[PDB]
Symmetry: D2
Subunit: 336 residues, 4 copies
């Protein structure tokens, strides 16, 4: 059967989920029947047609009354800050893609359930009470039909976990620390202005700006064997999109650059195909823009010194994650 989906929060994440669905030729048996956003529907349609990072949408978008029509599909448009008031039950909603950032716990995301939706996928790290945290390609097999509110982790965790899973299986990971060299986001600023975080209060276009991230530590939610073994932080730099996971870890046994690369090449050609890619060309970050993979491992950067191993992976922090939201939607509704 066809999964009826709605997108709560038509910001960048929600817009890129919708665009990912149409730009892969709706390969998932999914129908987006509604979007909720406080912005003017004409403005959101315009930002769907044109994007700086991801170019022009290769389709048609029009506004007709209470609907945005995308390639002939009429999508109901809503504007209500309180999700519990949305008519999910009347629309027969199967899955709410919760992309606002304000409803990341199971209790808060349950407002969608109160409105009549069957399930919720949070496009972000969830509270400790969520039923599951999923990196598709790594641990979607843990999903069950009884799960009603899950987290899709973060963009960074979806890049790191496919990288570390095969390495732990074949080599063993004692402990690891990560730096993600990360594009700036809209939580940052153009010129210095008041901000809850004194570093993010500084111009993102002119500086490297450290900031905390739990993505490395969150790999333990997806790979329990690595609980407490990984940590790290991020350095925001002046690029608009595409980021880099830089993981240094102590292997449990002696290895080489070639063996490390061979493990990830086999994973990219096998169990993790189309989720993890294997790259040997001399590419730069923009070459991975609009790439739907979760983790684009760069074998040219691999370094080994003793037991310390350094592996790096490019990821489009918007496009890979938005595509994974669709994969996880299908897996959740297929769970028994």
């Amino acid at each position: 059967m066809t999964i009826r989906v709605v997108i709560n929060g038509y910001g960048r994440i929600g817009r890129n989920i919708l665009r990912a669905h149409y730009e892969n030729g709706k390969k998932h048996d999914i129908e987006i029947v509604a979007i909720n956003d406080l912005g003017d529907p004409k403005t959101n349609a315009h930002l769907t047609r044109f994007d700086t990072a991801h170019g022009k949408f290769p389709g048609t978008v029009t506004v007709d009354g209470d609907y945005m029509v995308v390639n002939g599909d009429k999508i109901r448009v809503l504007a209500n800050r309180n999700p519990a008031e949305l008519p999910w039950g009347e629309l027969g909603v199967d899955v709410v893609l919760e992309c606002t950032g304000f409803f990341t716990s199971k209790e808060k995301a349950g407002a969608h359930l109160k409105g009549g939706a069957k399930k919720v996928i949070i496009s972000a790290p969830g509270g400790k009470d969520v039923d599951a945290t999923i990196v598709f390609g790594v641990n979607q097999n843990v999903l069950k039909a009884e799960h009603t509110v899950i987290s899709n982790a973060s963009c960074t965790t979806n890049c790191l976990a496919p990288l570390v899973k095969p390495l732990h299986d074949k080599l063993g990971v004692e402990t690891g620390l990560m730096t993600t060299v990360h594009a700036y986001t809209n939580d940052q600023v153009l010129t210095d202005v008041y901000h809850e975080d004194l570093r993010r209060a500084r111009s993102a276009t002119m500086s490297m700006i450290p900031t905390k991230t739990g993505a490395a530590a969150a790999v333990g939610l997806v790979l329990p064997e690595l609980n407490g073994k990984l940590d790290g932080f991020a350095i925001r730099v002046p690029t608009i999109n595409v980021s880099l996971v830089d993981l240094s870890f102590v292997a449990k046994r002696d290895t080489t650059v070639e063996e490390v690369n061979s493990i990830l090449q086999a994973a990219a050609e096998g169990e993790l195909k189309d989720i993890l890619t294997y790259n040997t060309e001399p590419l730069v970050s923009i070459d991975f823009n609009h790439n739907p993979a979760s983790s684009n491992f760069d074998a040219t950067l691999t370094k080994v010194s003793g037991k310390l191993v350094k592996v790096s992976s490019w990821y489009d922090n918007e496009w890979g994650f938005s595509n994974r939201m669709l994969d996880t939607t299908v897996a959740l509704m297929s769970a028994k």
Copy 2:
């Protein structure tokens, strides 16, 4: 006979006013006795000490109880959204520098007067009910002792008016059109996201972005002879500070590049000294960063074809305006 001033709204404008006052070695007979802002005082002190565009403040800033100490001066720190409740009368406030953007009409800014302040200067274009709109160096002579709420115009108007006045006096301006090539501001965005204006919704770091400007029409408030004679627009480009007025106008008689430049050089050396500067060096925009002048005419860029004249002037859209706020404060208190 020292003017006791307070800053309402310690954003970038309010911070740059305070920094301008202390960096020129408190050259005005002004004492900043209080700041009102809803933000954490420690955060605002940090952003006073460090700025990307304007560098490190060459002084000391500390927070001690209810005061921010700048070079040893205790400045009361307040946080009250209703100006009528502020203790301006108890603090003997002469002038409120209104820098929040929420009290730009005389009706709204009068709340400061109810609180005990004598006068208010709005750091932006004012409503139609303001007693005056002032570009210092051009029309501060219109101020009278009875004026209680005035506008300091905008940064763009403070660059255009000193540029066009001497040319109008000696040549005559029949009509004119201008483009303001302008640095991005915090009203813009890092990557495409909802905005009231569909063009400002687009990444400011990657595109030239057209936007409206009222400077051309607002010059008529400061120079009534030019009412309705000027029009134009602005283009935001990926620079953090410093902007450019590019004015094309039809003169009332034929002229030459040499005469046009000579007129502005005389004004820069005379009546408009320290407000309008005359530049002949091969400079670029960043060379005018942290320049306190309102209008830096670039004689190297002048073009003339018969009556058609093209003149260009660089201006630090933050620092020039901030210094002019201090000049206008003294002029208002000296008005008879």
Copy 3:
């Protein structure tokens, strides 16, 4: 029936000509049989596959011996700084697209003729002795079979001429001055370093940088009725591609914003279709990236104040010009 073309200089202009030829489905009866460049063929093939400004080439590129194979077409790769030594006669070359910038006079470009080529098109303004200067869509009808070395003008002139010709025909242009807000190019620098021009010696990523340009003054070569009537200069700003022509001119009779826009709308739908486009949407510069038109008139920016008229047009300064090089190749070989 097929025009045999070679590209001398496989820098950005030459590469974008080749990419334009293949991305339009090779719609012109043109075969690129050789490219000459001093760079390594593997390097030039890599830069054909991947570009920052224009994305990934939607085709295949490989290196096989002395050939670069593009979508199965074997293209001879040469590396000789002296074009007169190139085997144009042996390869039956009809037209050399001269894109190095070193052979812009008819005498110098004649080196290709000595090598056996029939004709040369310079991808830049030519010396005074070139047989013609062409803005395709405007004056390609002046080409004759006897012309052997021509200029395709510049990207800026190809944007300006389609904009100003309809206006001169219907309104009349007395005189005009223009600014081109222009993306930086590889003649500029990342951080201050020695340069023949002291303004271009300054970081292009941080400043607006004035620079000379002859595009407006040279328009008389393409539209002799406007000889001597136009001039201007450029402001380089921190964008990687796409620029804006900003023309202010005195019309010979009274007009209005609506009449000015109507003139250009008729031209865009008629004589100048697909060369000049007519835009009314609230777009920004990146929206015109990879747009093959010569001149994208922005009707939303038009201003009129008395007899002074301001019209503006976006242009992809690389892609429009590269596509026009192909159009002019066909027109030159079709000339009677």
Copy 4:
């Protein structure tokens, strides 16, 4: 008793050495008596007066005949491609600061000695035949009076060595891998164009760009106990100046964040004072611009998991190195 120095190559490195000498109040007993450069002396003086990254020189620069006058000091200006022909002996030159990049071996740099100079310091990694490689503050004690050609290492090595030496002494470094997040340089490009390295051929303003660095292996030249223990690479990102060393290493034993930070705090307060700094404030990269230290350790970024340690240090990749060139000059002439 005053060391007479000349600068061979007045590019950015030579300019910043001169500016460092004058902007610290000539704190070294050094007089710059000549500079050799093939560029126009007026252009080089202009770029000394104005810089985008480092602002305006706080002094006087004029050109008078064959001399450039800096704060009243007449500096002979020479232009000779053959250093053996330079009048170093006639000028009594003690130390040649070799900053051209063309004389990085002792064999090549000896041409200055043939010209009459006593010693040469290469402002870059040297060939295997150089008498020493110096990171000032770490191993300048290895210098001997008999040394005639030495290397000052690189900016990255001058940041890494002060960071890792105290950690090795007190904690022990078994092995380490580093990433240096590095500002772009003038070896990179604004938009994709030919380069000997296929990654530096890509726009430096739009991408994170991996590149090789010898700093990790070159630390073994200054700290022989660490020979072969460190490896890594660099990521160029879109900032104009200031870079970051991000070192992950396996310690010889389990440790904690507090112990790691304490070791570096003691070093910054002791033997490595003014070379290594200790920072606890929430700063970003631009806050370290124009900072003369070799290594600005950021205690806020430290991470520890068992034996695995991650430490980060900011460094002005231009200004720190330029000041170290002066320190190493004095040490070389004081060596016994």
